[PDB]
Ligand binder design. Structure first.
Ligand SMILES: OC[C@H]1O[C@H](O[C@H]2[C@H](O)[C@@H](O)[C@@H](O)O[C@@H]2CO)[C@H](O)[C@@H](O)[C@@H]1O
Ligand SMILES: OC[C@H]1O[C@H](O[C@H]2[C@H](O)[C@@H](O)[C@@H](O)O[C@@H]2CO)[C@H](O)[C@@H](O)[C@@H]1O
Ligand SMILES: OC[C@H]1O[C@H](O[C@H]2[C@H](O)[C@@H](O)[C@@H](O)O[C@@H]2CO)[C@H](O)[C@@H](O)[C@@H]1O
Ligand SMILES: OC[C@H]1O[C@H](O[C@H]2[C@H](O)[C@@H](O)[C@@H](O)O[C@@H]2CO)[C@H](O)[C@@H](O)[C@@H]1O
Ligand SMILES: OC[C@H]1O[C@H](O[C@H]2[C@H](O)[C@@H](O)[C@@H](O)O[C@@H]2CO)[C@H](O)[C@@H](O)[C@@H]1O
Ligand SMILES: OC[C@H]1O[C@H](O[C@H]2[C@H](O)[C@@H](O)[C@H](O)O[C@@H]2CO)[C@H](O)[C@@H](O)[C@@H]1O
Ligand SMILES: OC[C@H]1O[C@@H](O)[C@H](O)[C@@H](O)[C@@H]1O
Ligand SMILES: [Ca+2]
Length: 516
């Protein structure tokens, strides 16, 4: 892995459930059999959207958790685990969706202003999820929903492994800046989503809190605004992304705009820990999208990420750490391209997010963004998962492997693996002063032979005069590997003469000893 590490010993594979309710796909008894088959193929748990539109449909505090209870009882019957997602966003309208579950329609009547929804630069209204500016309504409604779900689901504590929150559209902490109705779908630039009158008022009040008075705002921004009502979000989003972002105004607007998501993360994490920690005592997570298009457009740099709310990932991740939420990044299977017109850099983006998460001590999980039809994309996922310290990978979605036995077996081989520590010992190594010793090998868990970025460090044992490492490996998979030496300057000096192998890596911890 990176940094001379190996794969995360906590790694688990998860399967996403269908977006529709199980009886719309298969009967409960077959579903139980399906869960046993997923378990045999290395899946630890099923993730499942429990839609707000299903659970509080008819009015405020009119709850119905019966579908989630029935689902959990079939998970229990199958000897499986589940990860509920408390899906306070709409099903329908985002990539891959095959469902139609708006959030409950009565929520929109809780305010007579425009505080609850989003409006884009060009006036497109989005009602996929509550606007995180409406923190009073979110505190009330999410707190009530999380508390009632916990009470209804307490009998199923034994099968709940983790709970996910929904921070925004498609279950991701973001603004709805890429949508067909707004003309901002992939691979286009995004539009900022802060043009309700309420969002304009909140930015204005934030700016006047920061600086005190309009006279100090103008000194800070180098502007000549005549009245406070001229404090506004960008009137020309394209120009803002071309060059306005560099100004003091631009840094303040992006700080505020991303800051709404950071504060929302704080709030939903407080609400979730209060609702769930005593009842369930499980990890709680939230998701960030991989907005990989327009990454390196030279004219509008990061022109889809910034409107989505992603201006500074380090600061965004710090909010997850503070809120005690684990992070899932949802686009792992793709390759960098970087070419006109999409300017798409998804692998660079997950490497950067993973590096930051690992730096900050945030448990990091991954998903694939689009359905996978080919083993090559599983190999891509494995490269990321097993070299960048991912604790989990969730496969979108159920039917793609449940009804494709060939592809299921490729998943089991490459990603449905159980980590096991093994001690690797290499004898008679001709190191000199300054040399370090590593292993590399064929599978992604061994860095796929990449000696530069991914090799696993061994350590001299002066009692035995050999080099040893306790390496986490995929149980019951075949591997080939070799030790090699790096000089002080980091260059590869020499290699173990003979290719080593384990056919397979044993299920239980032992050791593999070889000579150089
Ligand atoms: O400070 C002068 C001017 O700045 C901004 O104008 C932008 C404009 O929005 C873009 O369409 C393009 O014309 O670039 C301008 C910057 O040179 C403000 O939006 C505007 O109010 C202000 O007058
Ligand atoms: O809120 C002040 C001013 O902000 C916007 O103008 C920005 C523009 O968006 C930036 O790209 C850059 O050019 O700086 C401008 C401020 O000097 C709004 O477009 C404008 O209406 C508003 O008055
Ligand atoms: O938020 C939903 C989904 O959006 C992005 O998915 C892209 C996908 O990566 C592209 O290849 C193409 O299909 O457009 C989609 C957006 O409509 C994110 O990459 C993904 O993380 C996120 O879940
Ligand atoms: O069932 C979870 C989640 O799936 C979809 O959103 C995905 C998006 O399609 C993928 O790119 C992905 O791996 O990231 C998002 C979050 O998992 C649905 O659109 C969403 O409603 C649903 O909650
Ligand atoms: O690069 C892939 C290649 O890596 C290893 O080959 C080493 C070989 O072991 C060394 O003795 C020397 O020849 O350098 C090679 C890399 O340039 C693996 O042994 C080999 O299986 C794998 O294809
Ligand atoms: O002998 C091969 C496997 O057969 C069954 O697996 C089924 C699984 O039960 C079902 O859910 C899935 O759709 O089809 C596979 C293959 O028919 C046994 O349950 C497995 O243990 C066997 O390995
Ligand atoms: O295959 C298992 C055995 O493989 C050999 O390559 C190693 O030298 C042994 O230490 C190991 O127990
Ligand atoms: Ca309520």
């Amino acid at each position: 892995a990176v940094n001379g590490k190996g794969m995360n010993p906590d790694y688990k594979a998860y399967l996403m459930a269908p977006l529709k309710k199980i009886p719309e796909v298969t009967n409960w008894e077959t579903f139980e059999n399906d869960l046993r088959w997923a378990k045999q193929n290395g899946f630890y748990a099923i993730t499942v959207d429990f839609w707000w539109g299903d659970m509080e449909k008819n009015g405020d505090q009119q709850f119905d958790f019966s579908y989630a209870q029935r689902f959990a009882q079939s998970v229990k019957n199958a000897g499986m685990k589940m990860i509920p997602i408390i899906s306070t966003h709409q099903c329908g309208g985002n990539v891959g969706d095959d469902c139609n579950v708006p959030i409950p329609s009565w929520v929109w009547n809780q305010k007579s202003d425009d505080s609850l929804y989003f409006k884009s630069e060009t006036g497109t209204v989005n009602k996929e999820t509550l606007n995180p500016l409406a923190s009073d309504v979110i505190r009330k409604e999410y707190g009530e929903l999380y508390t009632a779900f916990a009470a209804a689901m307490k009998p199923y504590k034994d099968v709940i492994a983790k709970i996910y929150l929904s921070g925004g559209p498609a279950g991701e902490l973001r603004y709805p800046s890429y949508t067909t109705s707004d003309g901002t779908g992939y691979p286009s630039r995004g539009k900022f989503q802060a043009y309700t009158e309420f969002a304009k008022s909140k930015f204005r009040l934030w700016v006047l809190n920061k600086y005190g008075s309009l006279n100090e705002v103008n000194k800070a921004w180098g502007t000549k605004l005549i009245s406070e009502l001229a404090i506004l979000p960008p009137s020309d989003g394209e120009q803002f992304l071309m060059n306005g972002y560099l100004s003091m105004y631009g840094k303040d607007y992006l700080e505020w705009y991303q800051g709404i998501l950071e504060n929302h993360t704080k709030l939903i994490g407080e609400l979730a820990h209060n609702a769930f920690d005593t009842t369930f005592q499980v990890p709680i997570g939230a998701k960030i999208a991989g907005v990989h298009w327009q990454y390196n457009n030279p004219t509008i740099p990061h022109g889809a990420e910034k409107p989505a709310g992603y201006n500074d990932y380090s600061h965004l991740l710090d909010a997850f750490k503070s809120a005690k939420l684990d992070v899932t990044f949802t686009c792992l299977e793709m390759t960098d391209k970087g070419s006109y017109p999409e300017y798409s850099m998804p692998k660079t983006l997950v490497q950067n997010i993973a590096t930051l998460a690992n730096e900050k001590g945030i448990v990091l999980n991954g998903e694939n963004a689009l359905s996978i039809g080919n083993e090559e994309e599983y190999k891509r996922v494995a490269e990321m998962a097993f070299n960048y310290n991912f604790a989990g990978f969730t496969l979108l979605r159920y039917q793609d492997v449940m009804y494709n036995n060939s592809l299921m077996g490729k998943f089991k081989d490459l990603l449905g693996v159980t980590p096991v520590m093994q001690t690797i010992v290499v004898k008679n190594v001709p190191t000199t002063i300054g040399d370090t010793v590593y292993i590399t090998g064929n599978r992604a868990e061994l860095g796929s032979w990449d000696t530069k970025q991914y090799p696993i460090q061994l350590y001299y044992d002066s009692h035995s005069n050999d080099w040893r490492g306790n390496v986490v490996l995929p149980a019951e998979r075949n591997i080939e590997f070799k030790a090699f030496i790096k000089s002080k300057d980091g260059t590869v000096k020499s290699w173990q003469t003979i290719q080593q192998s384990w056919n397979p890596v044993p299920l239980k911890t032992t050791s593999h000893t070889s000579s150089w």
